[PDB]
């Protein structure tokens, strides 16, 4: 402290912050690819949803609305991105 760098902040410490108060901001929310194996056609789903994104063809569910990250509804297998 009292002589240091903000051109190179350390990684986990700069990840410790709130998203807005980082050095150059870029968010943390994620896209991924949910499979309920009844349909082998993958659904790219955001970290949060607000809305019950169901399966593609068979109308059941894939997620519930949360206060935080969206809840993958337990018939699930996924790559992230």
């Amino acid at each position: 402290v009292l002589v240091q760098d903000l051109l190179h902040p350390t990684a986990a410490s700069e990840a410790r912050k709130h998203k807005l108060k980082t050095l150059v901001q870029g968010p943390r929310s994620y896209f991924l690819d949910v499979k309920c194996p009844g349909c082998l056609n993958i659904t790219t789903v955001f970290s949060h949803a607000q809305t019950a994104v169901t399966c593609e063809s068979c109308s059941t569910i894939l997620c519930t609305p949360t206060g935080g990250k969206a809840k993958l509804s337990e018939g699930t297998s996924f790559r992230r991105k």
């Binding site: 807005l20 901001q25 870029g26 896209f31």
Partner: protein
């Protein structure tokens, strides 16, 4: 912080540094343009279109892939409504709280909140009347609003 209330809270989106790709992403512009046109035929507000193409479909942002945003598309494809969405929701909340006062004379706190809503109506409608996206002579009053908004 908070034009008509006391908080100072920060809560928002944050557009990434990218003015190009995702490059996990492969699709074309026209596909999600068609999807916007489809959901406009269903009749949703552009916030709800952005929400639904966020979570359900893989779209990151409209403006990265398609250089006209969602309301530019609805205006450009002849499906823009009379009043923009936020002013509409303000008048909708206004006629809601007004009706709530029309059956409840007793709550003055609701009347205070109603007058704050009306102040936001006048400020925001004045911004819209400024840049001519309302007609100059656009008029707000509850007598007209009861048939106007809904």
């Amino acid at each position: 912080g908070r034009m008509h209330s006391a908080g100072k809270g920060i809560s928002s989106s944050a557009i990434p540094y990218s003015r190009n790709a995702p490059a996990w992403f492969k699709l074309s512009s026209e596909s999600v343009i068609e999807q916007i046109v489809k959901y406009a035929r269903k009749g949703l507000t552009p916030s709800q279109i952005g929400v639904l193409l966020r979570d359900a479909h893989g779209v990151t942002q409209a403006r990265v892939i398609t250089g006209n945003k969602i309301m530019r598309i609805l205006k450009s494809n002849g499906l823009a409504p009379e009043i923009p969405e936020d002013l509409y929701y303000l008048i909708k909340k206004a006629v809601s709280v007004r009706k709530h006062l029309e059956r409840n004379r007793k709550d003055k706190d609701a009347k205070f909140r109603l007058i704050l809503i009306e102040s936001r109506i006048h400020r925001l409608a004045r911004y819209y009347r400024t840049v001519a996206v309302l007609p100059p002579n656009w008029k707000y009053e509850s007598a007209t609003a009861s048939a106007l908004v809904n």
